[PDB]
């Protein structure tokens, strides 16, 4: 599926069904580090992603690169 890049480069491949929410994605990305889903922002193709939206509704296919940001 998808690739999640940091600011300073640094990639984290997540396997997602085109159905789980972006809150579910974050909870997965958060799990894949040592942080809370609340500190994670996601930015894809000219927009911030939203907790309610399904990876499907976002227009994400496999191979795609999405920026993540970690917070305070």
């Amino acid at each position: 599926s998808l690739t999640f890049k940091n600011f300073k480069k640094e990639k984290v491949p997540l396997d997602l069904e085109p159905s789980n929410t972006i809150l579910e994605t974050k909870t997965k990305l958060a799990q894949s580090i040592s942080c809370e889903e609340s500190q994670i922002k996601l930015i894809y193709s000219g927009k911030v992603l939203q907790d309610s939206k399904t990876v499907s509704e976002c227009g994400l296919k496999d191979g795609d690169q999405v920026v993540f940001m970690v917070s305070q």
Partner: protein, 955 residues
């Protein structure tokens, strides 16, 4: 190729290349291998823009760069349209539009996205050149709305604009022309999007924190800084006026005009903005009421005698809000009044939702009854409020605390400036030999000089704003609308102005009424806060001093005069007599003839408005009496100031409006008891008012001579400042007493002219003779003759006019034999020579008195002296029993004198017995009386006996 052109259009529009190390600005793309591939085109565009914004360099203004990419994009589309293959490049421009806008949203949604700058710098760039960012911003707004993230946008933009206004400009105020305009343009751009308008009040810091101090509402709240934009801000006033305070009138006027033109545009724009909020949704409009109510609630000391200015909202903020609230109220108060019933008269029947009413004095009720009224009255869960009704009473709240605090601030400035000039003048005299002391004195001069410049500049700016007729008209029209509303609340039918209101509400009362009157005060009106009446009237009195006053020639003026006359006609409505004092003072300003001698500006209404012409005369004659019972009370709006104000109106009504002249004559003929009560009061004040005026005028001289001393006694000099206080105080009281004396005497002259017989009935005629003769003695003797002040007009002191009026009264009553007789019998003052001296004095002001007038006065005096001569002849020849031995009704020597307990008259036991036989009253004052209650006058009985024995010895 055509795979070129696209690639190169992308290069020129994002200003970026890869291999490429030549020719134009463009940043060489660093450094990833994935973007090293020397094609380019449509799907590399995200990558490129991500490089620009996250990867850095000194792309130090990321958001400015986005805007330019967007401009450059629009540019290229236009240039491409008119060339062979516009189509082929369409996919390219779309992708750039798509992503530049998209990331523009992102940049204005989360703080750390780009790694140069933050919201504050992006907003600063926007404020600096808003017109350049506007098309892009509009696309940004629209994109966020469409993706369901508008509030994220607003919470980055608007709180950031707060900080920009408090921290990045030295003063966000009218002086910062470009900046304040661009800030307004930002609000307008956003708030014109309806989905933005509906949630705007949900922005962080839209409301004030709980701990936010009142002066900080205008600084720490989303709308504060823009709402505070006004020419009556100190820094603005100093810049525009403190500039050259010695300017001509012509020169000051042009400054007023630019500032008014500018202030008008600001109110228009603030109103457009807030009206969007109000229309956005029930939430937004309720939150606005809430926001304005909180500001009002924490600003009550704005009306204290010495407001703590630094702990309160500013005049500019509060006045601007007042005008916006006025503007929201206009529609339901237009002259047709068809929407007037939308405002709930029972607004205060429930406990108040937004306005804090704790500590607010009511019109005719105390805390006790009002809280009781809430209990009985209630109104259920949720139940409230209605925007229109919230807005209307909030407007009244601001008129009092907002505008009202602004006009009192300005009113006191004349005195502040004069005191300040005097302190500076004194400190300028100090010879400071010691360097430290010399630095001290100059720091003190310089601090006072700064305060003086600030105050003088603000007086100008405030004058500019109150002379601004276009703005003040709105305030006064609100007042007139509010007046109609309030007459509608009082009406038992609640039908006015569609049907006339019938006054009086309760039959007129033929010793402690307060309780009765409160008990019959109308509900719910008696519970309305005093501020609903204090606001209009303070405003109206104050704004009268302006040439461009919104009151002068305003066709709605009628409504306010109507309300005023109602309030003066029905003592029940408003218990506070200082309030009524202000109201009558307002009517008197309306009655004052204009500089060219034409009727005062309210004369027309007094004449033609039915509710007024039916009620004002009675109202004035009744109020003239009632003010006596002013228990606790003090000047101004003193009983004497009120009587003075009433006299002006009475006198003008009688000169210029025949219908009021007839109503006056009518009251004297057909309602004598009411009318005599007014006259007795007028007469009684006239026994002391000249004395009081002279005495105060002599206390001025005592004080002035104590000041002059210089070798010093002190014979006591208490405190020099207390002397100036005592000197101003004696000056006030001198003017107020002489002024009233002049007016009362003139009322005696003009009335006695038409209804001489009202002035000659028993209860008036002896007291009148006594009072006229006494006042005559001052005017023609040393009481007036030894008084020498500079400019006696300063003190309404015209002994010549008062003498002229006084002597005319004698003339006007000169054919009433009861008067001729009362004057002839007044042993205390009467003396023919007083009239000779009057004639000699009147002839010292040429034209004061005609020869015809002089002959008339002398015919009068001659008749009086001749009545007195006849009386004394009658007594020498026929008055062989001393008078106090004679029964008062039977004229014969008393056998058994007794004292009546009510009248204290002596009368013979047989006479009172014969009286009480058929009529159970004191025959002199009609007081209930039983024979048991008379008291033997033994002392008197012994004189009569001694007397009868003296005479028995001759016969």
């Amino acid at each position: 190729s055509p795979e070129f052109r696209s690639m190169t259009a992308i290069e020129d529009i994002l200003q970026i290349t890869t291999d490429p190390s030549d020719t134009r600005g463009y940043s060489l793309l660093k450094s990833e291998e994935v973007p090293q591939g020397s094609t380019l085109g449509v799907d590399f565009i995200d990558t490129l823009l991500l490089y620009q914004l996250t990867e850095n360099e000194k792309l130090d203004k990321p958001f400015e760069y986005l805007n330019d990419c967007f401009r450059r994009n629009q540019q290229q589309k236009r240039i491409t349209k008119n060339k062979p293959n516009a189509e082929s490049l369409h996919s390219t421009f779309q992708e750039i539009d798509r992503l530049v806008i998209g990331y523009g949203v992102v940049a204005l949604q989360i703080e750390n996205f780009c790694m140069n700058g933050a919201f504050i710098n992006y907003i600063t760039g926007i404020v600096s050149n808003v017109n350049s960012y506007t098309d892009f911003l509009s696309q940004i707004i629209q994109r966020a709305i469409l993706e369901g993230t508008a509030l994220d946008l607003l919470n980055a933009v608007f709180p950031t604009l707060l900080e920009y206004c408090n921290k990045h400009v030295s003063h966000f105020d009218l002086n910062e022309s470009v900046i304040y305009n661009n800030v307004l343009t930002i609000f307008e751009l956003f708030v014109t999007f309806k989905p933005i308008a509906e949630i705007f009040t949900k922005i962080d810091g839209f409301f004030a924190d709980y701990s936010c101090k009142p002066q900080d509402f205008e600084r720490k709240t989303i709308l504060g800084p823009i709402l505070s934009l006004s020419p009556i801000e100190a820094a603005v006033a100093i810049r525009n006026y403190g500039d050259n305070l010695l300017r001509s009138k012509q020169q000051t006027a042009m400054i007023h005009e630019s500032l008014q033109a500018e202030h008008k545009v600001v109110i228009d724009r603030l109103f457009f903005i807030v009206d969007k909020l109000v229309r956005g949704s029930l939430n937004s409009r309720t939150d606005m009421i809430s926001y304005f109510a909180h500001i009002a609630n924490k600003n009550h000391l704005r009306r204290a005698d010495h407001p703590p200015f630094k702990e309160l909202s500013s005049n500019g903020f509060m006045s601007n809000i007042t005008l916006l609230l006025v503007r929201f109220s206009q529609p339901f108060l237009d002259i047709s009044y068809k929407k007037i019933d939308k405002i709930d008269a029972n607004y205060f029947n429930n406990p108040s939702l937004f306005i804090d009413l704790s500590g607010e004095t009511r019109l005719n009720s105390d805390f006790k009854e009002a809280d009781a009224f809430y209990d009985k009255n209630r109104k259920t869960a949720d139940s409230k409020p209605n925007f229109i009704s919230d807005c209307f009473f909030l407007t009244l709240t601001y008129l009092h605390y907002g505008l009202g605090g602004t006009l009192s601030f300005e009113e006191k400035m004349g005195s502040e400036i004069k005191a300040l000039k005097e302190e500076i003048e004194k400190v300028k005299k100090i010879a400071a030999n010691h360097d430290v002391f010399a630095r001290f004195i100059t720091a003190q001069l310089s601090k006072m000089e700064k305060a003086l410049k600030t105050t003088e500049s603000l007086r100008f700016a405030l004058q500019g704003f109150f002379a601004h007729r276009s703005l003040q008209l709105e305030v006064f029209d609100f007042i007139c609308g509010a007046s109609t509303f309030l007459i509608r609340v009082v009406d038992p039918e609640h039908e006015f102005p569609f049907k006339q209101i019938k006054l009086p509400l309760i039959p007129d009362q033929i010793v402690d009424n307060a309780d009765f009157l409160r008990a019959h005060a109308p509900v719910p009106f008696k519970y309305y806060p005093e501020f609903v009446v204090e606001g209009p009237v303070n405003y109206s009195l104050y704004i009268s001093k302006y040439q461009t006053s919104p009151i002068f020639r305003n066709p709605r003026l009628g409504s306010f005069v109507e309300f005023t006359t109602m309030v003066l006609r029905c003592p029940e409505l408003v218990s506070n007599p200082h309030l009524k004092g202000k109201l009558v003072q307002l009517l008197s300003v309306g009655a004052m003839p204009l500089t060219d001698n034409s009727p005062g500006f309210m004369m027309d209404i007094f004449e033609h408005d039915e509710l007024v012409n039916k009620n004002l005369l009675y109202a004035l004659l009744d109020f003239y009496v009632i003010v006596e019972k002013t228990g606790s009370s003090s000047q101004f709006y003193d009983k004497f100031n009120s009587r003075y104000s009433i006299s002006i109106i009475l006198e003008e009504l009688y000169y210029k409006i025949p219908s009021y002249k007839n109503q006056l004559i009518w009251q004297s003929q057909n309602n004598a008891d009411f009318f005599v009560r007014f006259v007795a009061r007028m007469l009684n004040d006239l026994t002391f008012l000249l004395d009081e005026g002279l005495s105060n005028l002599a206390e001025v001289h005592n004080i002035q001579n104590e000041l002059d001393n210089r070798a010093r006694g002190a014979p006591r000099e208490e405190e020099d400042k207390e002397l100036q206080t005592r000197l101003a105080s004696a000056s006030r009281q001198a003017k107020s007493s002489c002024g009233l004396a002049d007016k009362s005497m003139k009322l005696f002259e003009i009335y006695s002219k038409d209804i001489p017989a009202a002035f000659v009935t028993p209860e008036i005629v002896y007291r009148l003779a006594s009072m006229l003769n006494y006042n005559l003695e001052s005017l023609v003797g040393p009481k007036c003759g030894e008084l020498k002040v500079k400019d006696p007009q300063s003190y309404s002191f015209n002994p010549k006019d008062l003498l002229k009026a006084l002597t005319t009264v004698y003339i006007n009553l000169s054919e009433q034999s009861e008067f001729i007789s009362a004057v002839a019998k007044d042993e205390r003052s009467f003396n023919r020579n007083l009239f000779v001296r009057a004639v000699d004095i009147l002839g010292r002001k040429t034209g004061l008195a005609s020869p015809e007038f002089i002959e008339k006065l002398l015919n009068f005096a001659n008749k009086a002296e001749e009545q007195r001569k006849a009386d004394e002849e009658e007594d020498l020849e026929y008055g062989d029993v001393p008078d106090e031995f004679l029964d008062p009704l039977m004229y014969t020597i008393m056998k058994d004198p007794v004292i009546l307990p009510a009248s204290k008259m002596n009368i013979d036991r047989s006479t009172i017995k014969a009286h009480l036989l058929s009529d159970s009253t004191d025959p002199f004052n009609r007081m209930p009386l039983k024979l048991e209650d008379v008291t033997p006058n033994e002392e008197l009985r012994q004189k009569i006996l001694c007397f009868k024995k003296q005479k028995k010895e001759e016969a």
